[PDB]
Write an enzyme that holds these catalytic residues in place. Structure first.
Site, PDB file in Angstrom:
ATOM      1  CG  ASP B 141      29.934  57.597  34.778  1.00 10.45           C
ATOM      2  OD1 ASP B 141      30.618  58.114  35.732  1.00 10.45           O
ATOM      3  OD2 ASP B 141      28.827  56.770  35.530  1.00 10.45           O
ATOM      4  CG  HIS B 213      31.197  66.143  36.722  1.00  8.65           C
ATOM      5  ND1 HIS B 213      29.895  66.666  37.885  1.00  8.65           N
ATOM      6  CD2 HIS B 213      30.922  64.707  36.682  1.00  8.65           C
ATOM      7  CE1 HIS B 213      29.361  65.277  37.926  1.00  8.65           C
ATOM      8  NE2 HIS B 213      30.214  64.379  37.983  1.00  8.65           N
TER       9      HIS B 213
HETATM   10  C1  HEM Z   1      24.647  63.658  33.698  1.00  4.11           C
HETATM   11  C2  HEM Z   1      25.028  63.161  35.400  1.00  4.11           C
HETATM   12  C3  HEM Z   1      26.601  62.719  35.291  1.00  4.11           C
HETATM   13  C4  HEM Z   1      26.984  62.465  34.622  1.00  4.11           C
HETATM   14  C5  HEM Z   1      27.838  62.619  33.356  1.00  4.11           C
HETATM   15  C6  HEM Z   1      28.746  61.934  35.180  1.00  4.11           C
HETATM   16  C7  HEM Z   1      29.952  61.983  34.876  1.00  4.11           C
HETATM   17  C8  HEM Z   1      30.978  61.600  36.074  1.00  4.11           C
HETATM   18  C9  HEM Z   1      32.217  61.051  35.220  1.00  4.11           C
HETATM   19  C10 HEM Z   1      32.708  61.127  33.712  1.00  4.11           C
HETATM   20  C11 HEM Z   1      32.963  60.684  36.333  1.00  4.11           C
HETATM   21  C12 HEM Z   1      34.609  61.148  36.215  1.00  4.11           C
HETATM   22  C13 HEM Z   1      35.171  59.518  36.362  1.00  4.11           C
HETATM   23  C14 HEM Z   1      35.151  59.072  37.165  1.00  4.11           C
HETATM   24  O1  HEM Z   1      35.758  59.155  38.856  1.00  4.11           O
HETATM   25  O2  HEM Z   1      33.540  58.141  37.706  1.00  4.11           O
HETATM   26  C15 HEM Z   1      32.486  61.391  37.757  1.00  4.11           C
HETATM   27  C16 HEM Z   1      32.919  61.521  38.467  1.00  4.11           C
HETATM   28  C17 HEM Z   1      31.590  61.455  40.023  1.00  4.11           C
HETATM   29  N1  HEM Z   1      30.999  62.283  40.027  1.00  4.11           N
HETATM   30 FE1  HEM Z   1      29.894  62.289  38.353  1.00  4.11          FE
HETATM   31  N2  HEM Z   1      28.272  62.177  36.761  1.00  4.11           N
HETATM   32  C18 HEM Z   1      27.145  63.022  36.001  1.00  4.11           C
HETATM   33  C19 HEM Z   1      27.170  63.377  38.147  1.00  4.11           C
HETATM   34  C20 HEM Z   1      26.775  63.885  38.993  1.00  4.11           C
HETATM   35  C21 HEM Z   1      26.320  63.579  40.180  1.00  4.11           C
HETATM   36  C22 HEM Z   1      24.627  64.487  39.957  1.00  4.11           C
HETATM   37  C23 HEM Z   1      27.008  63.080  41.405  1.00  4.11           C
HETATM   38  C24 HEM Z   1      26.900  63.527  43.054  1.00  4.11           C
HETATM   39  C25 HEM Z   1      25.747  64.537  42.979  1.00  4.11           C
HETATM   40  C26 HEM Z   1      27.959  63.129  40.987  1.00  4.11           C
HETATM   41  C27 HEM Z   1      29.507  62.402  41.732  1.00  4.11           C
HETATM   42  C28 HEM Z   1      30.268  62.684  40.902  1.00  4.11           C
HETATM   43  C29 HEM Z   1      31.679  62.222  42.191  1.00  4.11           C
HETATM   44  C30 HEM Z   1      31.507  61.817  42.648  1.00  4.11           C
HETATM   45  C31 HEM Z   1      32.699  61.533  41.024  1.00  4.11           C
HETATM   46  C32 HEM Z   1      34.378  61.552  41.465  1.00  4.11           C
HETATM   47  C33 HEM Z   1      34.656  62.796  41.408  1.00  4.11           C
HETATM   48  C34 HEM Z   1      36.711  62.049  41.742  1.00  4.11           C
HETATM   49  O3  HEM Z   1      36.207  62.568  43.550  1.00  4.11           O
HETATM   50  O4  HEM Z   1      37.264  62.405  41.074  1.00  4.11           O
HETATM   51  N3  HEM Z   1      28.444  62.590  39.152  1.00  4.11           N
HETATM   52  N4  HEM Z   1      31.204  61.501  37.212  1.00  4.11           N
HETATM   53  C1  LIG Z   2      29.003  60.339  38.184  1.00  3.83           C
HETATM   54  N1  LIG Z   2      28.367  59.178  37.363  1.00  3.83           N
END
Ligand code: HEM
Ligand SMILES: [C-]#N
Ligand code: HEM
Ligand SMILES: [C-]#N
Ligand SMILES: [Mg+2]
Ligand SMILES: [Mg+2]
Lengths: 299, 298
Positions: B141, B213
């Site tokens: 993450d 996601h």
């Molecule tokens: C259970 C909750 C969540 C988990 C386990 C989770 C997990 C992840 C993971 C594994 C990544 C990919 C690695 C990275 O680029 O950081 C990611 C990307 C991201 N997450 Fe989450 N996330 C969660 C909730 C959220 C929420 C609530 C939002 C926004 C409202 C969010 C926004 C993002 C964004 C903007 C990215 C980057 C996507 C990209 O530009 O590739 N995430 N998240």
């Molecule tokens: C997504 N932290």
């Protein structure tokens, strides 16, 4: 022969303690314990910088079943001391994980739960952390008179011979601090309560401090020989919720720990530890930590 | 001058405190000034901690403290997906982050001493960076999180006007069900996230489901990404409740809201595949003023 990795390490910044009851057949703990110590060796190999250690220890009833009543002669269920001032919450299993890295401890705790599975019912899971200047949350330095170095800590904590050679007795007790009550006390009052000065951590002479001071209650000698224990306690909790000290001690003799508890809780001379003015124990248990070879011979 | 907790990268630990105002809104004025002074003292005492912190305010209290000036996008956190994302809007958010949990704990105690009985703490979460910077699900993450002070400042910090130096904050605690996750094959978990698990390689957008996601949150408007600065961390106990405490900063609340409307089914009727194993249980929006604005709280 070999001591479990979590008894002797010094200065670890983080720990996890899990206390649990046995839900099923006691024989389920045999393979689960072997799996867990194999898991600890895997995490030590993967994260050598963590300087990870762990202990699996057993309550009286369970250990009597697993050992066939052989050895652990001093083991018993934790009694209520001071007629109730120290409550008793004796469980069947204790898992203590300590290292320089909380994140590695967390993975090890998940591995412990996977190994024991639904054979156990977790009653407590506490995440300890070393606070600033190695202070207890009361603001007093913790640790000063704790046995130092592997040689002395081994002498105090590890059983030297017989069927239990390499094992140790463990005592755990969670305290809940009332820091608002502590802060109502002047610093001269808090120092007479502990028996050491707060800022500079200087021992107050035994003839100058009250007999109820913590040091007067627990720095015990029998014909000039100190009843030493190896403490692994750490602060725990949230700033806004419950917080305090998770007390944990190892000793080759349960006797040394019991004498300190009888003293603190009024059973020896009718006087009790002055720290009860701001903090209280809410759990209490005794466990036996077998040697690593004894865990391998559980099958 | 931006509040110190918005921009730091690679924090090992954090504390989030969410609270309601019990007393007079004017008690938050002095308390906030005391707290930012305490943060400067702890930064001086523990320079190696790389300590930062943020004080941020909910819509109703910020409208009162600001006199209705600025913070044009601020509002109470609504539910998204008609209930899939619950709402637990509080009045005050305190976020403390650093390389040392023990320093964060002292700073949290200083925050509670400063605000005193003017607040009712609703939540206190202690975040920890897990092994290999992975979420508890086992996926890395932070990979596409804006990197470096320059880019993070561009994404998170308001550039001009009355709110210059401020930022909008969104916090949402998720509770992971790792038993449900472990029933899924690794390839199925990888299509749920949109990245491979062990190697952390992005799965091409045309190869992964639109519910993945990354497909829900990697949003672009005419080729420009709706970026946010995430400060989320794992939290919890192995035997009890555990998951991700989601926290994000943005110069525009819009970018965060678009990602939530997408994740929770409001944009195209499709929901984030992560809802198969984890769920959000809190939710709030806050406004983090600049430090000059906190000093001017009169
Ligand atoms: C259970 C909750 C969540 C988990 C386990 C989770 C997990 C992840 C993971 C594994 C990544 C990919 C690695 C990275 O680029 O950081 C990611 C990307 C991201 N997450 Fe989450 N996330 C969660 C909730 C959220 C929420 C609530 C939002 C926004 C409202 C969010 C926004 C993002 C964004 C903007 C990215 C980057 C996507 C990209 O530009 O590739 N995430 N998240
Ligand atoms: C997504 N932290
Ligand atoms: C609220 C819980 C407790 C607090 C805050 C606490 C605090 C302290 C402090 C500040 C010291 C002095 C510094 C040091 O030598 O480590 C100390 C010493 C010690 N404590 Fe505790 N303690 C607690 C509970 C206990 C319990 C339950 C026991 C044993 C049953 C115990 C046994 C000891 C021993 C053996 C010493 C060393 C005394 C000496 O030889 O000078 N403590 N404790
Ligand atoms: C005493 N600890
Ligand atoms: Mg002495
Ligand atoms: Mg992308």
């Amino acid at each position: 022969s070999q001591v479990q990795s979590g008894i002797l390490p010094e200065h670890c910044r983080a720990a996890i303690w899990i206390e649990a009851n046995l839900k099923g057949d006691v024989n389920a703990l045999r393979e689960a314990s072997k799996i867990f110590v194999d898991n600890v060796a895997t995490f030590q190999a993967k994260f050598p910088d963590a300087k990870l250690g762990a202990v699996v220890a057993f309550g009286n009833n369970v250990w009597r079943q697993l050992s066939g009543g052989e050895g652990a002669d001093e083991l018993k269920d934790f009694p209520v001391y001071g007629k109730g001032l120290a409550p008793s919450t004796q469980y069947d299993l204790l898992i203590h994980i300590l290292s320089a890295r909380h994140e590695v401890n967390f993975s090890v705790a998940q591995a412990a739960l996977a190994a024991f599975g639904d054979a156990i019912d977790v009653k407590e899971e506490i995440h300890g952390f070393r606070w600033v200047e190695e202070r207890d949350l009361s603001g007093f330095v913790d640790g000063t008179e704790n046995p130092a170095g592997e040689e002395t800590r081994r002498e105090v904590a590890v059983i030297k011979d017989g069927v239990d050679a390499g094992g140790s007795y463990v005592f755990v007790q969670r305290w809940e601090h009332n820091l608002k009550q502590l802060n109502r006390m002047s610093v001269p009052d808090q120092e007479m309560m502990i028996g050491r000065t707060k800022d500079a951590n200087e021992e107050i002479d035994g003839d100058e401090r009250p007999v109820t001071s913590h040091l007067s209650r627990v720095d015990l000698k029998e014909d000039g020989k100190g009843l030493k224990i190896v403490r692994q306690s750490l602060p725990y909790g949230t700033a806004s919720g419950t917080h305090g000290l998770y007390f944990c001690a190892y000793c080759a003799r349960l006797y040394n720990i019991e004498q300190q508890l009888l003293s603190m809780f009024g059973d020896t001379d009718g006087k009790r530890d002055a720290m009860l003015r701001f903090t209280k124990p809410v759990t209490g248990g005794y466990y036996f930590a077998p040697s690593l070879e004894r865990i391998q011979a559980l099958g």
